[PDB]
């Protein structure tokens, strides 16, 4: 992955003119610094390996966190799967229009002790359950629901004190690639919903406790971390400049191009 | 010389005395769809002479305080002859595109336009909590124009049309990453874009998905000394390439 | 059970790991590939595309288009300075929010030569000559046309080709430089000077303009990815 180097030159004077170009044709010129001044023939050994698409993307990042309280009615958390709730990853993925990649998933779970009232509480080890529901499946509504059977729905059980769990999901989409932008409506009358929210139908995620409220309540907190593999991208995009506003849409407030200086000649 | 192009498709031809080179997409040419790629169970149709001719939209007048105009591309041709007929009668379809914008003036005027085409161009509403209606996104073969100021918040469903943010909240200086061309009145006279079909799905319905958007932004304001013609228009010419259809259903 | 010892460094979670994981979709059938035009495969393909830099930052043009226009008019005397700004593609605000400046904000280290394309968007009957000068650091910013010609420069004359390019070469004591502002790895300044005046005939406006572009050459390389300081988020988007 070695970058090319430059070659020496001699003093030249002819009407072969590389320096004068025409940018009106929409073509970036391919001049070399060996054509504007005399240079030395240098060996070069830099690479562009750390600038590939995979090294730019295959690094994990948090996308969401949620809580739930043990000693409560319907203490259980849910979250619709989307990647436009955190400003760091959403801004990174909006550099490309069409993405097709493999996905890897990890979790990390902490806990906390609630201000209870019982005397000399001491809890055993707690375990947690994460169940994925494909779009169209049944829904849970309480902590002891028959939806938690996990008959066919893939799920995982995890214990505190051990390593964080990890699973891997292959490329699941109706089309050929995930799309970061969709300019259209759902209805053929061109009404109602407009934007990326129409395609965003991938399922939901439910977390819940396994054990019971023994004597004192416990509030936990999970965090979900995405990490892509085998990435392929198409149609690069200029980066998002202004701040993000919403998740279902792409609305924005107007802002200047950059911060300003005091003069056009100042330094 | 290299200044002269001659573009002929079907029954209509466009020639020009001087213009720059033609910029062709992302390096490919528009093609028909091969058997290994298809998912339509039925055989498509190809009119291919009744659709691969040129069309002309409504011309707009370039003024001094002009902000910029746009069109949603496979929507403004929905009344343009048999292509407008064939768009109404099918369920699927994919098209290529050739775009040729032209605007002429004397050697005594000044100004430099920018013509870029963007695939998958979302917009933003005035009120942040809503999305704008259909009629503000495009007109039938007419231009929607930008403003050099900020659209207010009191409006319900209107597109925020601040020029320096381009409606998508990006920096307009970075817009040249898409295939673009320049029209400088000092040396150039017209621009030519050739674009292939860009989508995640090999075919699409055209009524509820605009996969291409054309934008024209004046960086340098049009300037002239007194005595020349003050009324200068801008015309566009759009012709599709190798289009086809599937799923014959009623008219809508 | 094989006799093995747990090495230090297990049961950890690294932000940039690389391992294999058991799948959750057993024998999933993936949708086949598709020949989508414009497949990028390295980040330096974006970094070669030029972009218009907002030079005219005079505190009111940033919410306009006039930040990109560089005002050029006919004078009476000679030797004026058109503009000037330091060359730091990750530190200066002028080259910050441009496309090359944005990719550079995702890293720390960089090297390579930088092109500077200039287009004269004036009349056809206008004519002028210019001195596009670059100076390496070590002294101050040059102050006259005589001082700038001792640097590395080119004398662009407008003609039928209404474009020109400057290529500032890579002159550094180190193999790479920081994108963060520092005394130790400064890069010098770029200035543009009126070589002659601007010749205009009668019945022409005397106020022309020039546009600017900025791109990298083929020797460009970055290193040591970091997290960008531009966007910031407090609560969740919904």
């Amino acid at each position, epitope marked *: 992955a070695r970058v090319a180097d430059t070659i020496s030159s001699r003093p030249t004077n002819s009407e072969s003119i590389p320096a004068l170009t025409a940018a009106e044709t929409g073509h970036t010129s391919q001049v070399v610094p060996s054509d504007t001044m005399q240079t030395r023939h240098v060996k070069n050994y830099h690479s562009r390996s750390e600038s590939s698409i995979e090294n730019f993307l295959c690094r994990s990042a948090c996308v969401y966190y949620a*809580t739930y309280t043990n000693n409560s009615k319907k203490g259980f958390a849910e979250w619709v799967i989307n990647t436009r709730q955190v400003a760091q990853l959403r801004r990174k993925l909006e550099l490309f229009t069409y993405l097709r990649f493999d996905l890897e998933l990890t979790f990390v779970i902490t806990s906390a002790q609630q201000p209870s009232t019982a005397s000399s509480v001491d809890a055993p080890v707690q375990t947690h359950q994460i169940m994925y529901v494909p779009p169209g499946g049944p829904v849970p509504t309480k902590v002891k629901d028959y939806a938690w059977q996990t008959s066919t729905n893939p799920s995982v059980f995890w214990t505190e004190g051990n390593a964080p769990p990890r699973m891997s999901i292959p490329f699941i989409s109706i089309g050929n690639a995930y799309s970061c932008f969709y300019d259209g409506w759902t209805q053929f009358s061109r009404n109602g919903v407009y934007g990326i929210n129409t395609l965003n139908n991938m399922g939901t995620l439910y977390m819940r406790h396994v054990n019971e409220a023994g004597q004192g309540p416990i509030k936990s907190t999970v965090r979900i971390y995405f990490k892509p593999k085998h990435v392929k991208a198409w149609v690069p995009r200029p980066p998002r400049l202004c701040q*993000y506003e919403k998740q279902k849409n792409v609305n924005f407030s*107007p*802002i*200047g191009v950059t911060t*300003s200086r005091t003069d056009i000649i100042t330094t | 010389s290299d200044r002269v192009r001659s573009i002929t498709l079907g029954n209509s031809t466009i020639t020009t005395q001087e213009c720059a080179n033609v910029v062709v997409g992302y390096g490919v040419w528009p093609e028909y769809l091969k058997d290994n790629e298809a998912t339509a169970e039925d055989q498509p149709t190809q009119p291919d002479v009744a659709t691969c001719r040129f069309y002309t939209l409504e011309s707009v007048q370039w003024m001094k305080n002009s902000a910029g105009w746009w069109w949603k591309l496979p929507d403004a041709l929905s009344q343009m002859g048999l292509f407008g007929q064939n768009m109404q009668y099918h369920y699927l379809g994919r098209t290529g595109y050739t775009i040729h914008v032209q605007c002429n003036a004397s050697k005594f005027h000044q100004g430099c336009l920018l013509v870029v085409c963007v695939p998958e161009a979302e917009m933003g509403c005035s009120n942040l*909590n809503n999305t704008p209606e259909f009629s503000e996104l495009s007109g039938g073969d007419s231009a929607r124009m930008f403003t050099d100021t900020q659209v207010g918040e*009191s409006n319900a469903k209107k597109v925020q049309t601040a020029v320096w943010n381009a409606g998508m909240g990006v920096g307009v200086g970075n817009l040249t990453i898409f295939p673009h061309q320049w029209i400088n009145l000092r040396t150039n006279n017209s621009a030519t874009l050739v674009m292939p079909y860009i989508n995640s799905v090999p075919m699409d319905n055209m009524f509820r998905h605009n996969n291409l958007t054309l934008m024209i932004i004046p960086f340098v304001p049009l300037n002239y000394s007194e005595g020349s013609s003050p009324y200068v228009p801008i015309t566009v010419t759009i012709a599709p390439m190798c289009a086809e259809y599937n799923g014959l259903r009623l008219a809508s | 059970g094989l006799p093995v010892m747990t090495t230090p460094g297990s049961t950890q979670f690294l932000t940039s790991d690389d391992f294999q994981s058991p799948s959750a979709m057993p024998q999933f059938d993936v949708t086949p590939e598709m020949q989508i035009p414009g497949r990028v495969n390295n980040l330096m393909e974006i970094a070669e595309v030029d972009s218009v830099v907002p030079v005219n930052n005079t505190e009111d043009n*940033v919410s306009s288009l006039k930040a990109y226009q560089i005002p050029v008019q006919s004078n009476s005397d000679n030797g004026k300075q058109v503009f000037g700004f330091p060359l730091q593609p990750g530190a200066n605000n002028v080259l910050n929010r441009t496309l090359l400046g944005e990719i550079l904000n995702y890293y720390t280290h960089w090297s390579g030569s930088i092109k500077l394309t200039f287009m004269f968007c004036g009349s056809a009957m206008a004519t002028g000559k210019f001195l596009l000068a670059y100076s390496p650091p070590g002294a101050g910013v040059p102050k006259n046309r005589k001082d700038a010609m001792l640097g590395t420069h080119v004398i662009w004359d407008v003609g039928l080709q209404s474009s020109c390019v400057l290529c500032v070469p890579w002159i550094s004591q180190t193999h790479y430089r920081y994108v963060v502002e520092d005394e130790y790895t400064a890069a010098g300044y770029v200035t543009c000077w009126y070589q002659t005046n601007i010749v205009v005939p009668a019945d022409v406006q005397s106020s022309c303009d020039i546009l600017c572009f900025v791109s990298a050459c083929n020797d460009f390389s970055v290193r040591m990815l970091k997290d960008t300081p531009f966007i910031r988020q407090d609560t969740f988007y919904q």
Partner: antibody
Amino acid sequence: VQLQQSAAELARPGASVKMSCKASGYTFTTYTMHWVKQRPGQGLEWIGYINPSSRYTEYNQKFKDKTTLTADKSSSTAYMQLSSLTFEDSAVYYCARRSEADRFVYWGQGTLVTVSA
Amino acid sequence: DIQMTQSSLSASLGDRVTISCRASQDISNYLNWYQQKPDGSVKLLIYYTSTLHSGVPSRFSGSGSGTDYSLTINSLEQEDIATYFCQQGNTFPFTFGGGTKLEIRR
């Protein structure tokens, strides 16, 4: 990061006053800035906002004629200038920063503006 | 304009309290809950119907859907004795609720 208002003032009925909202700890030109008004026996009322990147103002329909929202990029502060002061204006004023979507995260300390004879 | 109706509540230490406010029409779950301290400081607790801000205790919780929405504190303490407001974020312009004071029982 915090928002710093000025002190309390007093003015003749019909006169004008100008307060300040000193912003520090964050980049000034990025985010917007608003102004609300709370009468002491009432709730809260929104007045208007001002984008310092473009100097664009927009009021509520109750205060379309009176207030003037000004801000300068240098000192990173904003001024809310009231005109034709009456006894309705005897209230407490806050300046606040609008969130990512619609919330108000950072709030100033509040100042008291009274009119009397 | 969206009308925001909401008045004065008293309760003792460590009990479960609730505050409820409704709108004029449906707001589709775009609600916030603020707290104005007795000295004159203002902070944000729940930036949605249920999701707490970072840095506040977990004693607070909010619920409700459609028109009717409720803010609940499970255990009352001294630092919580202030007023609280609800504010819509759906339509221009932003309308705030009325005051709702808290105080000791006896």
